[PDB]
C-alpha cells in the first residue's frame, strides 16, 4: 500500500455574504473528498459512493447530530477570536485534522487551527502542548492546556481512532484509491523543451528534465499536477534549450514504482 | 459492544477495593467511571484514554487500551465509599456504553 | 449555579397518562441527555441534544419524545404512559459534544411508577 491519508476540515466565516454558509465541515481521503456538510443545508452527507454504499443512514444521521454541535462552537470561538484581535468585518476561522498511513506502516498524525488562512494554533501530540503563534491564541493555549484530559483524548484519537477509520475507508474505497493508472508521457518544443504527462492515477507523480545525464533543478520549470476532470491528472515540466551547444536532455517521469525515460533526438 | 463489572462487591472498612471493568467496543475514545450513591445522581470520578494509572485522592484509576481493562481503586475506604459505581467507555461514535455498576458495600 | 434541576422527584401515573419531565440546567452546557436507569442494566439514553436547536432519538425513544426548548431545557414526554416505563429518569448535560473527555453533570432524577 502506498500512503494514504484522513483530514477532516472545517471553515467557519463571520459575515459571509447572503446564501453563503457560515460553516462547512469537508473531510477528505488523499484527495477525493468523501463527506460534506454546512449550515445551509445543516446535513452531514457522503461525497463518493463508495462511502454512501458503506455507511448506514444511522452514521450520516449521527454524524449530522455532531456537526450542528460543532457548527455552533465554531461560531462562539470565531467569536472570542474577532473580539480579542479587535477586528471588524468578514473573519475565517479553520480547524484541519487528520492522520496519515505511511508505506512503510508508520503513522502521522496532526491538528491545527488558523485564523483569516494564516496558522494560529498547532498541536503537538508528542509534547501534548499547542503551539501559540501570536497572544490571542497563547491566551487559548493556556485554556486548551489546562484540560490535560482532553489532550491525551486529542492524542489518542490522532494515533488510534483516526488511523482505524482510514484504515475502513481506505477498504471501501480501495477500487478507487489503490488502482494504478500509469500516465502517457510525450516531448514536444514551444525555445524549450515540454514533458507532458496524463491520464494518471494517482495524483502523485515526479517530472525532471536531465541535461547529459545531470539534474539542474533550478534550471526546470515544474508545472502543477492537476485534475483532468475524469479522475485522472496531468503534469508537465520545462526546460530551456541552450542554442550555442548541443546536449543530450531527456524527461524522467517517476509515477507508482516505475520509472520513465524519454530521451530528446 | 459490551461492558461488564460485577455486580456487588463486599470489603472491610480500612482496606482497599479494586473494582473491575472490561470492556469491548467498535472504537475507543476514553473510559469514565462515575459515582453514584443510593437514590442519588451518578457523579463524575476519573477519565482514562491512554494506558496508566492516574491518582485522585484515594481513588485512583487504570487503564490498559490492548487488554480492554480498567480499574478503580479505593484506598482507606470509608462508609462513606458505600454506594455504586459505574464504568461507562466512549465508542468510535462519541457515544458512550454503560456498564450495570458495581454496589460496594462496607463493613465497618 | 444551581446545576442540573429536574422536576418531578416522584411521580405515579396510571397506564394511558400523558407526562412531561422538565430539566434546566445553569451552567451553559450545549448538550443534554434524558437517560432511564432499571436495575441489573446500564444506563440507557433516550433522546438527546447535541446542542440548542436540535435533538436525536437514542437506543430507546419508542413511548417518549422530547423538546429542547432553548439552551437551558430540555424536556421529555411520555405521550401514553405504559407499565415498561416504570423506571428512574435521569437529565444530563455535558459542555458540549466535541469534548471527547467532558463528563456528565446528572440531575437528581425522576422516580416513575406506572399502573394499570
Known amino acids: 500500500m502506498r500512503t494514504h491519508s484522513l483530514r477532516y476540515f472545517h471553515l467557519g466565516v463571520s459575515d459571509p455574504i447572503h446564501g453563503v454558509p457560515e460553516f462547512i465541515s469537508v473531510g477528505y481521503v488523499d484527495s477525493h473528498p468523501i463527506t460534506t456538510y454546512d449550515s445551509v443545508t445543516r446535513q452531514k452527507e457522503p461525497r463518493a459512493p463508495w462511502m454512501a454504499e458503506n455507511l448506514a443512514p444511522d452514521h450520516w444521521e449521527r454524524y449530522t447530530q455532531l456537526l450542528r454541535g460543532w457548527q455552533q462552537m465554531f461560531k462562539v470561538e470565531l467569536k472570542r477570536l474577532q473580539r480579542h484581535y479587535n477586528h471588524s468585518g468578514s473573519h475565517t476561522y479553520q480547524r484541519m485534522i487528520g492522520c496519515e498511513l505511511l508505506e512503510d506502516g508508520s503513522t502521522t498524525g496532526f491538528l491545527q487551527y488558523a485564523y483569516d488562512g494564516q496558522d494560529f494554533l498547532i498541536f503537538n501530540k508528542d509534547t501534548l502542548s499547542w503551539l501559540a503563534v501570536d497572544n490571542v491564541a497563547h491566551t487559548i493555549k493556556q485554556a486548551w492546556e489546562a484540560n490535560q484530559h482532553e489532550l491525551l483524548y486529542q492524542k489518542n484519537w490522532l494515533e488510534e481512532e483516526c488511523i482505524a477509520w482510514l484504515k475502513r475507508f481506505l477498504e471501501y474505497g480501495k477500487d478507487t484509491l489503490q488502482r494504478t493508472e500509469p500516465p502517457l508521457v510525450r516531448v514536444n518544443r514551444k525555445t524549450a523543451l515540454f514533458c507532458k504527462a496524463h491520464g494518471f492515477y494517482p495524483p502523485e507523480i515526479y517530472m525532471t528534465w536531465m541535461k547529459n545525464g545531470e539534474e539542474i533543478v533550478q534550471e526546470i520549470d515544474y508545472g502543477d499536477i492537476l485534475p483532468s476532470g475524469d479522475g485522472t491528472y496531468q503534469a508537465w515540466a520545462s526546460i530551456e534549450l541552450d542554442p550555442q551547444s548541443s546536449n543530450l536532455y531527456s524527461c524522467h517521469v517517476e509515477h507508482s514504482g516505475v520509472h520513465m525515460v524519454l530521451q530528446v533526438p | 459492544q459490551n461492558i461488564d463489572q460485577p455486580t456487588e462487591m463486599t470489603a472491610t472498612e480500612g482496606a482497599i477495593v479494586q473494582i473491575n471493568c472490561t470492556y469491548q467496543?467498535?472504537?475507543?475514545?476514553?473510559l469514565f467511571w462515575y459515582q453514584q450513591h443510593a437514590g442519588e445522581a451518578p457523579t463524575f470520578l476519573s477519565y482514562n484514554v491512554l494506558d496508566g494509572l492516574e491518582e485522585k485522592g484515594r481513588f485512583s484509576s487504570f487503564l490498559s487500551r490492548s487488554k480492554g481493562y480498567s480499574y478503580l481503586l479505593l484506598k482507606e475506604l470509608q462508609m462513606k465509599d458505600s454506594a455504586s459505581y459505574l464504568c461507562?467507555?466512549?465508542?468510535?461514535?462519541?457515544?458512550?456504553?454503560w456498564g450495570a455498576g458495581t454496589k460496594l458495600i462496607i463493613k465497618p | 449555579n444551581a446545576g442540573v434541576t429536574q422536576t418531578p422527584k416522584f411521580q405515579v401515573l396510571k397506564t394511558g397518562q400523558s407526562m412531561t419531565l422538565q430539566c434546566a440546567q445553569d451552567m451553559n452546557h450545549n448538550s443534554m441527555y434524558w437517560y432511564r436507569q432499571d436495575p441489573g442494566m446500564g444506563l440507557r439514553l433516550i433522546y438527546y441534544?447535541?446542542?440548542?436547536?436540535?435533538?436525536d432519538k437514542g437506543e430507546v425513544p419508542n413511548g417518549y419524545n422530547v423538546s429542547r426548548l432553548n439552551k437551558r431545557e430540555f424536556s421529555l414526554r411520555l405521550e401514553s404512559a405504559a407499565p415498561s416505563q416504570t423506571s428512574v429518569y435521569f437529565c444530563?448535560?455535558?459542555?458540549?459534544?466535541?469534548?471527547?473527555?467532558?463528563?456528565?453533570?446528572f440531575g437528581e432524577g425522576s422516580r416513575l411508577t406506572v399502573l394499570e
Open positions: 444530563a448535560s455535558s459542555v458540549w459534544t466535541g469534548e471527547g473527555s467532558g463528563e456528565l453533570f
Open positions: 441534544s447535541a446542542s440548542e436547536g436540535t435533538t
Open positions: 461507562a467507555v466512549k465508542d468510535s461514535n462519541y457515544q458512550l456504553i
Open positions: 467496543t467498535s472504537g475507543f475514545n476514553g
